[PDB]
């Protein structure tokens, strides 16, 4: 399937993934396409904060899902 992510700079990035693909694989694809380290990625999907070690289907992610890339919180 295909998913879309909106980064900080307003650029929309398309990723070719599968429903069974893990979060780690998607983050690796994002790093390959853009160079963003997975540890620095804070993605929001309909208010859900993604976590490593899980899969897209764990977050009820479907076809043409749209995510945002918010930034880390340190206070």
């Amino acid at each position: 399937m295909q998913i879309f992510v909106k980064t900080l700079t307003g650029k929309t990035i398309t990723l070719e993934v599968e429903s069974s693909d893990t979060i780690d694989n998607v983050k690796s694809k994002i790093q390959d396409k853009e160079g963003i380290p997975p540890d620095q990625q804070r993605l929001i999907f309909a208010g859900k904060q993604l976590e490593d070690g899980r899969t897209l289907s764990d977050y009820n992610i479907q076809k043409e899902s749209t995510l945002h890339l918010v930034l880390r919180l340190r206070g």
């Binding site: 700079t9 307003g10 340190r74 206070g75």
Partner: protein
């Protein structure tokens, strides 16, 4: 090694026939309270021939032996007076990363040339007479003294966030959404004025074909063109005594060592100007911590300081006038965490969270492991 080559360079420099001190002695009396005024009154009138004689400094109404210590104390006081930001001659590059640089606003004075020539003479006198200042400039300053080309990476030493933004512009493409163009806004005494990097530059937006020229102009204006006259006067004053053929055998680090000596972090000041949360001054994890900091090498102390506070550079007056993210924030030691976890650091508040360990050896091991990824000096 690096040190042996530096010592060879120092010996060769001080062995030059054009940097030999004369046998005659020159007296120099300055009152302790009014050090800046008397120093500027005397130094700004000495001849170049006079400044090459032996320097003998005697404070007023303070008579004693070991004139070397007196001269060292005088140079310390003068260096902490002239380079003090409150005097509107120099300024910190950023409030949270203390780095001295020539203040662009210093041009407001009717005649800054005399003062900056005096500063140049002071620096040349310190280098000439084997006496050390104790100020810490930014690397671009030293690269300018030796007349080296300045590039984008040099902004890393001045301001980290500015360099990150410039590198972002260099790497990623720029659209027309950003309203960036060849002009810089500077707020001088309330009123904000616009400076054009290139003629008719305020009406030229930066496309993907101009951003390289934009970065070049921004770097040059931020590092050089904003302080042309003042630094020209300062370098004239400095080269009055030290010929430029002598300074140009060092680099941006050997010159720093020659000026300020081997940099060290004081521990007595650190202990006297720190505060604790949930920790008392008699708590074991405090006395062990201070013993460890007492018997440590300067590089590791600098690494710990950068790991905790955020930067390895200290204010001009030690830890007393230490700034945090929003304002003054002294070095804080806190009891937060479990025994197994390593010490943590909140940099924007200068906080070091040290869990309640049970022995000094374990504290030493945890603290040495936790600071490895941090590189200081």
């Amino acid at each position: 090694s690096h040190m042996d080559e530096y010592q060879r360079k120092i010996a060769y420099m001080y062995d030059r026939p054009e940097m030999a001190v004369n046998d005659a002695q020159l007296q120099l009396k300055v009152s302790r309270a009014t050090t800046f005024e008397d120093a500027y009154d005397i130094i700004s009138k000495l001849s170049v021939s006079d400044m090459k004689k032996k320097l003998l400094i005697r404070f007023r109404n303070e008579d004693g032996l070991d004139y070397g210590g007196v001269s060292r104390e005088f140079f310390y006081i003068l260096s902490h007076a002239i380079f003090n930001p409150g005097y509107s001659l120099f300024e910190y590059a950023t409030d949270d990363n203390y780095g001295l640089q020539i203040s662009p606003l210093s041009s407001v004075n009717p005649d800054f040339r005399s003062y900056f020539r005096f500063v140049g003479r002071v620096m040349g006198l310190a280098i000439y007479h084997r006496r050390y200042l104790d100020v810490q400039f930014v690397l671009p300053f030293y690269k300018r003294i030796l007349q080296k080309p300045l590039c984008l990476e040099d902004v890393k030493d001045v301001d980290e966030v500015y360099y990150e933004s410039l590198k972002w512009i260099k790497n990623n493409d720029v659209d027309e959404s950003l309203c960036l163009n060849f002009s810089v806004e500077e707020n001088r005494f309330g009123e904000s004025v616009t400076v054009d990097l290139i003629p008719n530059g305020r009406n030229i937006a930066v496309n993907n074909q101009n951003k390289m020229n934009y970065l070049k102009a921004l770097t040059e204006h931020k590092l050089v063109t904003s302080t042309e006259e003042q630094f020209n006067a300062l370098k004239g004053g400095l080269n009055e005594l030290i010929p430029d053929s002598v300074l140009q055998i060092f680099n941006e680090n050997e010159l720093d060592t020659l000026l300020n000596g081997k940099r060290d972090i004081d521990v007595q000041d650190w202990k006297r100007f720190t505060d604790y949360r949930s920790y008392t001054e008699t708590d074991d994890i405090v006395i062990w911590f201070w013993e460890l900091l007492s018997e440590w090498s300067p590089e590791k102390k600098a690494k710990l300081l950068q790991f905790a506070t955020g930067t390895s550079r200290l204010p001009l007056s030690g830890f007393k006038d230490m700034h945090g993210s929003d304002g003054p924030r002294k070095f804080t030691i806190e009891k937060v965490g479990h025994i197994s976890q390593l010490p943590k650091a909140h940099t924007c508040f200068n906080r070091l969270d040290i869990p309640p360990y049970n022995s000094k050896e374990e504290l030493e091991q945890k603290l040495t492991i936790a600071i490895q990824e941090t590189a200081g000096f």
